[PDB]
Design a protein around this ligand. Structure first.
Ligand code: CL
Ligand code: CL
Length: 401
């Protein structure tokens, strides 16, 4: 039989026809956000994972620090933090025994309005909210891989440290959240630099924790810094909270990672021959830089010598300046993501179905085709009873071997 698959392209949809017994179509389970997010937080806190509830951990603490993400990495801190302070208050901790510290890493300080954006005005008024000061860190150890862990003094000073943030697939750390709120967020330039170098390894990839060297280094540095407790928001593709996990910085994170996996990880027997990947329509395919995200997910599942068919309009062009310059071999996140594309092209072919014309499409080293069918029908010929994987929401769907 012949299967007929709508693939979103730009602000509409194309179609492809594939022999069903030759292809698998992997879909995400993109769950909708909970109706009462702040109540899901409190539910989470009452049912913590791998560790006692806060009610039993904090009695007598006088210097509690809550880590939150900065304006750059939008997290629902304003949803997570108020229920946390409610438990801290309930357990006898005054608001003057509580501080919020923003994990800037390299980024600039926040204005006051940005701070109120992050935690809510009510929290900002009753609790001190401090930016990471990257020049005021204190050394607490060195990891097995040689990262010196140097932590902002205000976090160093604390007798209790709660880490909050998002928990999603991450292209290098495997997943965000857990100890990542601390390393690199509230660490010195030496710490960020040395940990950042681990992202260039073959084990730093989405959906991988054990044997991911960046994530293992993060969790090791966070242990040297004695993170006591996490509260993490598991986010859907619309960045809405679908679940909160609280408790042990490892066990609560692992349970959050399985909720993410149920939504977006899709385990395949083996790497397939042809991967047909849509970005899921505009604006996920608004430019090639953004479309690289579906392509990154898709290239863990293409065989050496395989063919990717990337269905992405790229209405507004190649995207971020560094990524584009690298891709056009002009005469640092963007540059890496472009080299990621180049490495895949050494292993496989990539067809680009886009608004680009043939000259430009082949300048940047993709195959050209006017439709997804034309690209498939062409490369289906170059393979022998091929396995064909179809990702209609490649930007959020991670095939995994
Ligand atoms: Cl326990
Ligand atoms: Cl961009």
């Amino acid at each position: 039989g012949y299967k007929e698959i709508s693939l979103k392209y730009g602000k509409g949809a194309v179609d492809v026809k594939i022999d069903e017994n030759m292809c698998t179509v992997l879909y995400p389970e993109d769950l909708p956000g909970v109706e009462d997010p702040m109540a899901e937080v409190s539910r989470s806190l009452k049912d913590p994972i791998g560790k006692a509830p806060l009610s039993d951990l904090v009695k007598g603490k006088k210097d509690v620090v809550i880590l939150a993400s900065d304006i750059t990495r939008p997290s629902p801190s304003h949803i997570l933090i108020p229920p946390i302070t409610d438990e801290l208050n309930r357990a006898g901790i005054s608001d003057d025994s509580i501080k919020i510290v923003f994990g800037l890493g390299y980024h600039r300080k926040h204005t006051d309005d940005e701070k109120k954006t992050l935690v809510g005005e009510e929290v900002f008024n009753r609790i001190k909210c401090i930016d990471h000061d990257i020049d005021d860190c204190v050394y607490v150890g060195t990891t097995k891989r040689g990262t010196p862990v140097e932590v902002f003094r205000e976090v160093y000073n604390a007798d209790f440290i709660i880490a909050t943030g998002n928990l999603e697939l991450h292209y290098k750390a495997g997943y965000s959240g857990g100890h990542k709120a601390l390393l690199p967020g509230v660490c010195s330039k030496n710490t960020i630099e040395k940990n950042h170098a681990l992202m260039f390894s073959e084990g730093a990839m989405p959906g991988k924790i054990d044997g991911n060297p960046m994530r293992e280094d993060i969790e090791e540095g966070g242990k040297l810094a004695r993170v006591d407790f996490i509260v993490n928001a598991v986010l859907n593709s619309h960045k809405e909270i679908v679940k909160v996990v609280s408790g042990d910085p490892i066990k609560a994170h692992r349970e959050g990672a399985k909720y993410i996996d149920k939504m977006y990880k899709r385990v395949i027997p083996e790497k397939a021959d042809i991967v047909v990947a849509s970005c899921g329509g505009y604006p996920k395919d608004i430019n090639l830089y953004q479309a690289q995200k579906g392509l990154d997910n898709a290239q863990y599942s293409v065989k050496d010598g395989g063919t990717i068919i990337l269905v992405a309009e790229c209405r507004e062009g190649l995207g971020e300046k560094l990524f584009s310059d690298w891709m056009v071999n002009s005469s640092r996140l963007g540059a890496h993501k472009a080299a990621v594309i180049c490495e895949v092209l050494k292993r496989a072919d990539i067809y680009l179905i886009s608004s680009f014309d043939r000259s430009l499409t082949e300048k940047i080293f993709f195959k050209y085709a006017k439709t997804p069918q034309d690209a498939l029908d062409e490369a289906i010929k170059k393979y022998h009873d091929p396995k064909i994987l179809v990702l209609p929401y490649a930007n959020s769907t991670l095939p995994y071997v």
